[PDB]
Design a protein around this ligand. Structure first.
Ligand SMILES: COCC(=O)NCc1ccccc1
Length: 185
């Protein structure tokens, strides 16, 4: 792909984070802490899952960023509507305002309803995310495999401003402590 020139500098919004997440001082890395991180509750925080949003809101144009997933067992990445549900249980689907992929139990899947199997020969250490607001497109690229396409959501109905979306995943296994990191431009 040739989307690199739409690169945007994403930072994490502390105020949207689940109360167990630790966001780095530079707001470019996030990991799940071993306990509550001593923050007050607010209506923005994701309650049930270890999720956080980017600070940036997109309503037009073309945007590209990269995320490092090295040595993680489980994670979700993509974009979502600014107005997605924060509290209680919900599924990641376009009907709920999410355009995401994920890793879970050694398989990669796109957050369609129902979910779609992805065909990945080279486990990615970094993921590229491309959004074309006007075209209604969200695309995912395998940076480890020379930028090969993972998945394209097309005919997206964003229906609002978009925010970068992250889930560091559960760490029941003790094998998923590693952070998500926004990779430099
Ligand atoms: C440490 O691992 C246990 C675990 O993953 N618990 C579930 C959970 C943790 C934090 C926020 C939401 C849900």
């Amino acid at each position: 792909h040739h989307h690199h020139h739409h690169m945007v500098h994403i930072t994490l919004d502390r105020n949207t984070a689940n109360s167990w997440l630790i966001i780095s001082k530079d707001r470019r890395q996030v990991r799940m802490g071993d306990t509550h991180q001593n923050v007050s509750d607010n209506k923005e925080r994701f309650s049930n899952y270890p999720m956080v949003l980017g600070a940036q809101r997109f309503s037009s144009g073309k945007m590209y960023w990269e995320v490092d997933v090295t040595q993680k067992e489980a994670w979700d990445l993509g974009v979502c509507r600014d107005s997605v549900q924060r509290k209680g249980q919900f599924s990641l689907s376009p009907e709920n305002g999410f355009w995401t992929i994920w890793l879970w139990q050694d398989s990669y899947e796109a957050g369609t309803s129902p979910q779609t199997t992805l065909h990945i020969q080279v486990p990615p250490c970094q993921i590229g995310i491309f959004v074309d607001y006007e075209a209604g497109v969200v695309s995912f690229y395998n940076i480890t495999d020379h930028g090969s396409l993972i998945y394209t959501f097309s005919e997206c109905v964003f229906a609002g401003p978009l925010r970068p979306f992250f889930n560091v995943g559960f760490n029941y296994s003790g094998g998923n402590a590693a952070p998500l990191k926004l990779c430099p431009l």
